[PDB]
Structure 1
Amino acid sequence: ARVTVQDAVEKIGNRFDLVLVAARRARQMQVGGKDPLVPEENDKTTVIALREIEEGLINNQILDVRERQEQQEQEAAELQAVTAIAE
């Protein structure tokens, strides 16, 4: 549950970066991207994103690291797939 973002802002110390970060993470979890890191409690995706931010489980750095990992697994699978389609 969520009523204030004071601690979330305490983590990402901007309240303007916080919105952009939470929107990124929430669009991830909303379109078929991912699954929450904090146990969802019948919360909507934005509030889940905030609850994750508060725990220090999400920030800009975390998201970029995760994204580059995703791209690299993408490269690995895609090269293997083209190789398979060859033979």
Structure 2
Amino acid sequence: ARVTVQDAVEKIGNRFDLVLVAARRARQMQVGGKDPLVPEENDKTTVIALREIEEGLINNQILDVRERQEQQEQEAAEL
């Protein structure tokens, strides 16, 4: 979270992998513009990414599946 990221590390299992996943999600929320899954609570997108990973709402597989779902739906909207 804000002070310690231990819970996120136990949820992913690797400091480095946690950084990569959290950066991907924060990029989604900062540029991609999509809404957070936890309340804002006046935090920078980085910390919302960490908080979401703390609750198990965001895992690398979850990010992959959401991205694939949206991309396949756009490809369906092509036709």
> Which runs of 4 or more aligned residues in structure 1 lie more than 4 Å from their structure 2 counterparts after TM superposition?
none
Deviates more, 1:25-34 or 1:46-55: 25-34
The Cα of 1:12 is off from its aligned counterpart by 0.4
CA distance in structure 2 between the aligned counterparts of 1:24 and 1:3, rounded to whole angstroms: 20
Q: Deviations over 1:8-66 (max 9, x none)?
A: 10100001100000000000000033110001110000000000000000010000000
Q: Which runs of 5+ in 2 are unaligned?
A: none
Please tell me whether Structure 1 or Structure 2 has the larger radius of gyration of its CA atoms. Answer: 1
* Structure 2 equivalent of residue 77 of structure 1: 77
User: TM-score when scaled to structure 1?
Assistant: 0.87
The structure whose RCO (Cα within 8 Å, separation 6+) is larger is: 2
Q: How many residues align?
A: 79
Q: Which residue of 2 aligns with 1:57?
A: 57
